[PDB]
Structure formats: C-alpha cells, structure tokens
Amino acid sequence: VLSPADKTNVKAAWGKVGAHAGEYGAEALERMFLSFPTTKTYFPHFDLSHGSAQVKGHGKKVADALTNAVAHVDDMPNALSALSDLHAHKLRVDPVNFKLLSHCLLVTLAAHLPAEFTPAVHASLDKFLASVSTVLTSKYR
Amino acid sequence: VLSPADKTNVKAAWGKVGAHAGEYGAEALERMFLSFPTTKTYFPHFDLSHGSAQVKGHGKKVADALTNAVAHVDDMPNALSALSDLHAHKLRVDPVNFKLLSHCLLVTLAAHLPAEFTPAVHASLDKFLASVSTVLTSKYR
Amino acid sequence: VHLTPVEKSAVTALWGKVNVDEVGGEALGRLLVVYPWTQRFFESFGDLSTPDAVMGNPKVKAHGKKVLGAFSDGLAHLDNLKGTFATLSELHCDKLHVDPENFRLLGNVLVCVLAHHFGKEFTPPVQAAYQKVVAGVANALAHKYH
Amino acid sequence: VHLTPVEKSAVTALWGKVNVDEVGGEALGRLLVVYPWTQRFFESFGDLSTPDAVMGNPKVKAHGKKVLGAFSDGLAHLDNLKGTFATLSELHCDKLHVDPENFRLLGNVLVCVLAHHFGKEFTPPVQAAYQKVVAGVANALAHKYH
Numbered sequence: 001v002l003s004p005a006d007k008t009n010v011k012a013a014w015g016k017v018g019a020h021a022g023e024y025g026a027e028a029l030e031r032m033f034l035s036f037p038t039t040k041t042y043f044p045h046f047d048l049s050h051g052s053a054q055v056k057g058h059g060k061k062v063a064d065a066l067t068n069a070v071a072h073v074d075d076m077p078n079a080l081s082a083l084s085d086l087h088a089h090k091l092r093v094d095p096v097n098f099k100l101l102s103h104c105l106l107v108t109l110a111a112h113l114p115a116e117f118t119p120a121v122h123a124s125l126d127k128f129l130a131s132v133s134t135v136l137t138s139k140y141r
Numbered sequence: 142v143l144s145p146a147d148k149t150n151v152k153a154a155w156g157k158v159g160a161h162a163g164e165y166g167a168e169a170l171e172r173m174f175l176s177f178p179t180t181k182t183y184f185p186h187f188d189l190s191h192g193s194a195q196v197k198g199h200g201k202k203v204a205d206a207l208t209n210a211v212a213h214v215d216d217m218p219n220a221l222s223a224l225s226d227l228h229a230h231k232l233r234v235d236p237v238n239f240k241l242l243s244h245c246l247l248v249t250l251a252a253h254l255p256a257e258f259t260p261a262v263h264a265s266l267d268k269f270l271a272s273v274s275t276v277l278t279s280k281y282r
Numbered sequence: 283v284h285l286t287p288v289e290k291s292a293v294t295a296l297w298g299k300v301n302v303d304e305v306g307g308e309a310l311g312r313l314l315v316v317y318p319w320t321q322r323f324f325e326s327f328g329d330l331s332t333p334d335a336v337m338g339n340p341k342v343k344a345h346g347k348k349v350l351g352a353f354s355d356g357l358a359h360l361d362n363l364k365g366t367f368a369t370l371s372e373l374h375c376d377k378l379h380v381d382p383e384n385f386r387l388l389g390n391v392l393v394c395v396l397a398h399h400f401g402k403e404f405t406p407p408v409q410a411a412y413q414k415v416v417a418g419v420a421n422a423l424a425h426k427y428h
Numbered sequence: 429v430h431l432t433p434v435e436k437s438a439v440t441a442l443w444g445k446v447n448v449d450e451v452g453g454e455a456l457g458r459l460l461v462v463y464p465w466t467q468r469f470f471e472s473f474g475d476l477s478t479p480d481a482v483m484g485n486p487k488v489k490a491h492g493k494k495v496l497g498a499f500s501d502g503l504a505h506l507d508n509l510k511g512t513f514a515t516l517s518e519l520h521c522d523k524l525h526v527d528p529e530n531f532r533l534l535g536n537v538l539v540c541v542l543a544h545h546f547g548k549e550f551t552p553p554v555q556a557a558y559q560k561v562v563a564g565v566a567n568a569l570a571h572k573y574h
C-alpha cells in the first residue's frame with residue numbers, strides 16, 4: 001500500500017495536471033503504442049494514428065478514471081469495480097501492459113510537470129499506479 | 142485485492158495446516174534456500190543446514206506471521222506494520238524473494254494438503270501471499 | 283541447464299513415474315485459473331468460466347499433453363535446450379508475442395502440479411533440480427527476445 | 429539492438445545534448461528512492477534516509493557517472509551490446525548476484541530522467557528509440573543469466 005505522504009503527493013501532482021488530463025493521457029497512450037507496439041493488440045477497434053481523436057478521446061476517459069482513483073484512493077476496489085469488471089473479467093489484460101502504461105504515464109508527467117516530478121513524487125506516483133494496476137488486474141467479485 | 146471467496150478459501154486451507162505451521166514454514170524456507178540459493182544471502186547469521194532448529198524455528202515465526210495476517214486480512218498493513226518495518230525499512234528485501242518464498246509456500250501445501258489444494262484455492266493462495274508480499278515490501282509510514 | 287548427476291538422475295526417475303496424460307493438462311489448466319489474463323491466448327478453446335470448467339475442458343487437457351511433451355523433450359536435451367525450443371521460441375515470441383514472464387509462470391505451475399502429484403516424494407532437493415529445468419526451458423522459450 | 433536510421437540519429441543527437449554529470453546520478457539516485465531495496469547493494473555509499481540525501485550523495489553522483497558512461501558505450505555498439513556488457517554481466521550476475529528485473533528498472537528510470545531533462549524534446553518516437561536501447565542494455569547486462 002501507500003504512505004499517507006504518498007496519498008498527498010499524488011493529489012498535489014495530479015492536482016497540477018489540470019484540464020490537461022486528456023492531453024497527458026493521450027501522450028501516455030501514444031508513448032505506449034509507439035514504444036511497446038504489443039499494447040496495440042488490445043485495441044483492434046481503434047484508429048492508432050497520430051492525433052487520433054479516438055486515442056485523444058480515450059486518454060480523456062483513462063485520465064479521468066485515474067482522477068476518481070486519486071479522489072477516493074482508500075476505496076479503490078469499490079470505486080474501480082466497473083473498470084476491474086472490464087480489464088480483469090472481460091478484457092483479460094496482462095499486468096505487464098499495466099506496467100508499460102504506468103511507465104509512459106510517468107514519462108509524460110516528467111516531460112510536462114518537471115517541477116512536480118521530484119524523486120519522492122516519482123515514488124509516490126509509481127506506487128499509486130502500481131496500486132491502480134493491482135485493483136484493475138484483479139478479479140475481486 | 143482479494144475476492145471475499147478468496148479470503149474464505151485461504152482461511153479454510155490454512156485452517157487445515159494445524160500445528161504443522163512450523164513444519165510447513167520450515168519446508169518452505171528450506172525449499173527456498175535449496176532452489177534459489179540467493180535467498181541465503183539474506184540470512185548470513187543463520188545455520189542454513191537441514192534439520193537446523195534455527196531454520197525450523199524461523200519457519201515457526203514466518204508461518205505464524207502468516208497466521209495473524211490471514212486473521213485480520215482486511216487490515217494487513219496495520220497488522221504487519223512491524224514486519225514491514227523489517228522487510229521493507231530495515232532488511233530492504235527485493236520482492237522477487239517474496240515471489241520465490243510464496244512459490245515454495247505453494248509447493249509445500251501442494252505436497253502436504255493435496256485435497257485442499259484445488260486450482261481455485263491455488264489462485265486464492267497465490268493472491269493472498271502476493272498481497273502479503275506487497276504489504277511487507279512497501280513503506281507505508 | 284547444467285545440473286549435478288544426482289539431480290539429473292532424480293528428475294528422470296521422478297518424471298518416469300509421472301502421469302503422461304493429466305499432468306500437462308493440470309499444468310496448463312492451473313495457468314489459466316491462477317493467471318486469468320492468459321485465457322486471452324486460448325479463445326479457440328471455449329468455456330473457461332469456472333476452474334471446474336477450465337480443467338474440465340478437453341481442449342485444455344489435450345493441448346497440455348503437447349506442452350508436457352515439449353518438457354519431456356527438454357529433459358532429454360539439457361545440454362542444448364536453446365536449440366530444442368528454437369522453433370518453439372519463434373512460435374511464442376515472434377508469432378504469438380506472449381510476454382516471457384508467463385513462461386516462468388507455467389514452469390513454476392508445473393513444479394506446483396508435481397508437488398501435488400508426488401507429495402512427500404517431491405523433496406526439497408528434487409524441486410531444486412526441477413527449478414533448474416523449468417528456468418532453462420523458460421530461458422529457451424524466451425530466446426527470440428534476447 | 430537493431431533500430432531504423434532515423435531513430436539511430438535521433439538518439440545520438442538527444443544523447444549529444446545530455447548533461448554528462450547530473451544525469452547518471454539522477455538515474456542511479458531515483459532507482460534507490462523509487463525501488464528502496466536497491467539501497468541494499470549500496471551500503472558502501474552511506475546515508476540514504478531521505479530522497480534529498482540519496483540524490484545529495486557524492487558517491488551516488490560519482491557512480492552514476494560511470495553508469496551513464498556504460499550506457500554511452502552501449503549506444504556506440506548497438507550491433508554487439510552482448511559483448512560490450514559481457515564483463516559487466518559477469519560482474520552483476522556471477523559476483524554481485526543482482527536480480528535482472530532491476531536492470532529493467534534502472535533503464536526505465538534513465539528514460540524518466542531524460543523525460544525530466546528534455547521535456548517536449550523527448551517525443552514519443554525518441555522514447556521508443558530509447559526503450560529499445562535500455563532493454564537491449566538490460567538484455568546484455570543479464571546475459572550471464574541465460
């Protein structure tokens with residue numbers, strides 16, 4: 001789990017993203033598809049091109065699913081139940097992919113918020129994503 | 142995160158071990174040092190021989206640390222806070238060692254309780270040990 | 283892999299006593315129940331809703347026999363594992379694109395089935411020998427990645 | 429690793445703009461802060477109680493320079509990474525016995541430091557060119573493991 005200081009360091013880092021959630025979430029998604037092309041096989045119904053309003057439209061829902069996860073962090077299994085029903089139960093996503101997106105999500109935030117990306121916040125954000133990943137990769141019916 | 146079904150499965154399977162906690166925990170500990178000789182480097186103040194009342198005495202504390210963890214499951218970061226201060230804070234253990242011991246713990250019970258080791262219970266036990274491994278490797282100060 | 287003769291004899295003796303039908307199917311069957319994300323690769327298999335349905339699936343049972351056979355061929359060539367699974371590597375790596383951790387997971391789930399099957403007879407030194415075998419099979423199956 | 433001419437040129441130019449003093453130490457330091465357990469291999473370094481202390485550690489800053497130098501040597505030999513890091517593999521695997529997952533983690537933390545330093549300049553395909561390099565350096569540093 002996460003330290004109380006981690007719960008704060010995510011809230012104040014993600015609370016510096018702004019309405020830039022989709023832009024960042026789109027960058028994260030684009031960085032993943034480009035760097036690790038196997039993650040593309042999860043989206044055959046997707047236009048995986050540059051600028052794609054589908055990918056830029058996913059990164060919104062994705063970066064907004066991550067927002068309610070930052071809200072009620074100490075209630076992650078209950079709050080992400082529909083997302084877990086999708087990822088764990090329906091999609092059956094390999095957790096390595098979750099590590100790939102989590103990494104790209106950190107490269108994005110480091111590219112865009114260099115001041116909010118302190119060695120301590122990197123750690124907190126990585127712990128947070130690891131936890132979101134755990135809740136989304138597990139079947140807790 | 143564990144399914145409510147998993148929490149019961151672990152209680153009924155680990156609740157079939159009996160006073161053989163120290164025996165199993167010893168075997169798991171032994172199987173680990175034997176199969177993965179690197180886990181030995183964490184115990185230089187130990188007699189890592191067969192039969193050794195130290196290793197057989199460690200497997201007691203270990204399998205007993207696992208017993209209170211199964212008790213108050215839905216409180217595992219609060220419960221194992223001293224163990225976390227040890228494994229995570231003091232000893233600084235690479236979580237691979239935790240995947241390894243967890244593997245050995247599954248082999249031990251597989252060998253000793255073959256009936257209680259259904260594919261459903263294996264999954265439940267692998268999720269529990271993974272959850273315990275997380276807690277012990279994480280600094281939630 | 284290079285293991286000591288006592289361990290090399292111990293694995294062959296243990297493997298000789300193995301059930302060459304329902305072990306591989308139990309190994310591939312527990313892979314899908316414990317690691318659900320791997321069911322995604324076996325869509326051409328049908329009905330994997332309950333563990334009782336994953337194990338009790340003729341497709342899983344039959345495919346597992348060929349998986350166990352790959353391991354049997356692997357125990358025969360511990361000098362050259364990398365060449366025995368060279369075409370199997372090409373299949374899982376370059377054509378199926380299965381993440382290599384899953385190879386460690388099936389190898390370790392075989393070790394969990396053997397412990398189940400043999401009980402007291404799968405002693406700590408027999409596991410240590412088998413861990414060397416499944417690691418080398420996982421190293422050979424993930425060769426077209428390094 | 430084999431990469432396309434455009435990507436080979438894009439990494440050389442980005443690396444050609446790297447801070448050869450404070451990047452490797454930021455890469456090595458962040459490893460110790462994000463993945464604490466790694467501090468256990470660096471007891472001969474002293475004081476790593478706070479991130480500020482881990483980064484503001486002259487030993488970490490010094491060693492990290494020799495790590496970035498190993499990476500700079502790897503970008504020079506992308507045809508034979510396996511032989512450039514063979515002796516380095518012998519060191520980390522056969523003598524230091526470091527778990528190879530931590531080689532994936534250091535390389536992925538170098539990618540986070542270049543993202544931190546270059547910003548918009550560290551574009552998605554530049555990263556994609558660097559992810560190929562760090563994984564290859566991680567496949568070459570974990571060579572005496574397969």
Ligand code: HEM
Pocket residue numbers: 039042043061062063065066083086087091093097098099101102132133136
């Ligand atoms: C940081 C973790 C992630 C979050 C927060 C997340 C969130 C979401 C959300 C919100 C949806 C769309 C459903 C909706 O409208 O709410 C979704 C769909 C999906 N996710 Fe994730 N996801 C994450 C990571 C991943 C990863 C790493 C993969 C696989 C590489 C993945 C694959 C998919 C796929 C294939 C869909 C299809 C559904 C659709 O077409 O919208 N997700 N995800």
Ligand code: HEM
Pocket residue numbers: 180183184202203204206207224227228232234238239242273
């Ligand atoms: C199921 C996993 C684990 C549990 C429940 C656990 C539990 C324990 C317990 C209860 C102690 C002794 C302190 C006490 O309570 O009196 C301990 C100590 C220790 N553990 Fe673990 N441990 C686990 C896994 C590991 C692993 C995988 C390693 C590393 C290979 C590890 C390394 C150590 C070491 C080196 C000590 C030193 C302290 C002593 O000598 O007792 N532990 N562990």
Ligand code: HEM
Pocket residue numbers: 320323324325326327348349352353370374378380384385386388389419420423
């Ligand atoms: C390291 C252990 C493994 C061995 C020795 C192995 C061996 C094999 C062999 C021999 C085949 C059959 C080739 C034929 O049909 O002629 C096969 C097929 C296949 N393997 Fe593996 N495999 C292993 C692990 C995996 C893993 C970890 C996965 C994925 C979770 C996987 C997925 C598949 C799939 C999808 C097929 C084709 C079956 C279909 O039609 O869906 N294998 N494997």
Ligand code: HEM
Pocket residue numbers: 466469470471472494495498499516520524526530531534535565566569
């Ligand atoms: C993949 C990136 C890595 C590279 C290129 C690398 C490179 C190096 C180099 C060049 C040295 C210096 C050897 C000398 O002094 O002659 C070294 C030493 C060392 N490396 Fe690495 N290394 C890597 C990853 C790791 C990791 C992941 C760890 C540990 C978590 C590690 C732990 C060490 C330690 C402990 C030393 C000796 C310093 C000491 O404690 O006295 N290395 N490494």
